Amino acid sequence: KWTSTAIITQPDVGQIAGYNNAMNVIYGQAAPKVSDLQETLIGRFSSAFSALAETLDNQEEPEKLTIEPSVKNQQLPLTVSYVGQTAEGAQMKLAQYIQQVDDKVNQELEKDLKDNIALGRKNLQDSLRTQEVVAQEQKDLRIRQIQEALQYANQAQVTKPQVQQTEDVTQDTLFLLGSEALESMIKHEATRPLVFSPNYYQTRQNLLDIEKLKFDDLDIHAYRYVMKPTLPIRR
Amino acid sequence: AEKWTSTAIITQPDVGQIAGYNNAMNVIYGQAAPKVSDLQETLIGRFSSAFSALAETLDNQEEPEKLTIEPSVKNQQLPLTVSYVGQTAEGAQMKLAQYIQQVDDKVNQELEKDLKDNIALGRKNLQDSLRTQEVVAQEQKDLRIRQIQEALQYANQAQVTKPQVQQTEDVTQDTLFLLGSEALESMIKHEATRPLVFSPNYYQTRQNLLDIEKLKFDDLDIHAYRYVMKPTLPIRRD
Amino acid sequence: KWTSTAIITQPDVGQIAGYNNAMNVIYGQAAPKVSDLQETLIGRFSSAFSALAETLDNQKLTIEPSVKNQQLPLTVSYVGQTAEGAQMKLAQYIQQVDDKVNQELEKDLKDNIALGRKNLQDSLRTQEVVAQEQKDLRIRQIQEALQYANQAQVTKPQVQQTEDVTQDTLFLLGSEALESMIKHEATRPLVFSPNYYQTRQNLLDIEKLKFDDLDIHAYRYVMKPTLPIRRD
Ligand SMILES: [Mg+2]
Ligand SMILES: [Mg+2]
């Protein structure tokens, strides 16, 4: 029997640059810290590796595949080993299993990214919705204010404007525009498109940018090699 | 040894698995909602809590059962290796699968109650916010009406009935009487229908409160864990 | 020697609904997140629990994470003379620690309501003094304005733009109107900003915080103290 060992750890910032750049488009200032993404990716690799190790052992011809921390009081790196029938085999078989686990995690991350895109899209559409509700409630308040001013202008018998149309009118001074013009305003303000702040148009643009994201455009790795599978020794 | 161990590997649920629960928390707390990652940790924390309680109870029997939960890899928090030692291979697998489902059902009942408590807290916080904001809007309106009532005394003495101005920006306690006693009387007479002025936060808060009432517990497809590996059918004894 | 065990974790949102609400009433948008309160309360429970065990070790009582490398839940145990005794002594000690953590928080909350109550009532008093001083300045200005308006023989308003009326051109209003302002000065309302009305409302809400209604737990039971069937 022959033992090949390798040392794996979380992927580099450069390896996850794209994945990190996608999470920033989806969540913005709420995007996970680059270090948190690295921990999640190696967590998912470690998970799938343990499942392979437990399955390889539960066979008619069991295969010993291991995973343990390389350093005593440290979470990472991880030492992964395989026991093969030949020296060529133990080393290749360990390298194949590491690649097999990576391919499974890559399929999992593709699904996870789609779920993250959906949540981000939901958060942005919900933002557009509340902003639309406040724009509509603001428009209705203005109409409501002109309708009350029209009542004052009717009692004060103000038909023609007294004020030379001020862009800064108020609930109190509105009646000075006269019945005539206030009736016209209750029409114009009712058909007036909703007024949004730039944040609305930015949220709109953030939503289009999420649509522009692709999984294929990101070469995402769930691990990094510290040491590649070693040439085995007789054991 | 005449004992068979079935093993399973569990971890925190996927983002997709808890998309509903996370949305509920966002509807209830808004910007104060827990991060999606924090929800995942809490849910798996809750699953392993209930699992550990089952394991401690299964050991405290006339015929003790060994049900174990531990991190799969040393020094890692997740994933978790759950295992059970049965009388047969088919038995150990079914008994572990049943116990995992039993813990999940208990956790699910707990989360249903917790969600109801969360919807109550969120509602009370938003209701308190609208209340406070309505009083300030109403107190602001009453101040203006008392100012108008005062100004009407100044207009009655100066015998100002019709408006005296041809270009107004905004009026103060001093300048209000220039609108004339006729307009001022009209404003007091219709003070009841004068609309309250609120900030956008009020309209947002009011909408958040309606959306909380839209939340359903059965509509959430929530599970507290994810299987990495389902309970194994052991080939050989332990 | 029988060991009774229990599994404890952070309290539920429902369990600390009262504590969280009082923090929200006192701090508003600066209040701690409900999840942060849960972590703090269980942190306080474990620390008081370890403190009790340490004092008990000075003449048995243990606290440790249930699952290796998971901060929560926590496994607590006690070794008693009987299974029935071990169970009751663990339950009593858990309740004892809970009462101590609850008493420390009751006291902390009272300190917080006092400081808040102080800060808000100082804010209202400052604002009331400024509103009254502003009103008095304006009345002095109106009285001075009336003297000029009498001399300039300006009785009816001479204002075509409200923009023309400043604290130095009040005489533009009627001498008739300025007399009316001085005559009805006592009923001229004090002008406060919305912040005053908000502050006042916040003060009433803090004063509505009653300890008679609230009851909070620094922990939740995952598993109650076991009745051990065998010695160990
Ligand atoms: Mg005159
Ligand atoms: Mg005043």
Numbering used by the authors:
A (entry chain A): 5 to 239
B (entry chain B): 3 to 240
C (entry chain C): 5 to 63, 68 to 240
Q: Which statements did the authors publish about this structure?
A:
The Oag polymer chains are neither all of the same length nor of random length, and fall in a defined range termed the modal distribution. This distribution is regulated by two Wzz proteins in S. flexneri: WzzBSF, which confers an average modal chain-length of 10–17 Oag repeat units (short (S)-type), and WzzpHS2, which confers a very long (VL-type) modal chain-length of > 90 Oag repeat units. The S. flexneri Wzz proteins are members of the PCP1a family and are located in the inner membrane. They contain a hydrophilic periplasmic polypeptide segment, and two trans-membrane (TM) regions at the N- and C-terminal ends.
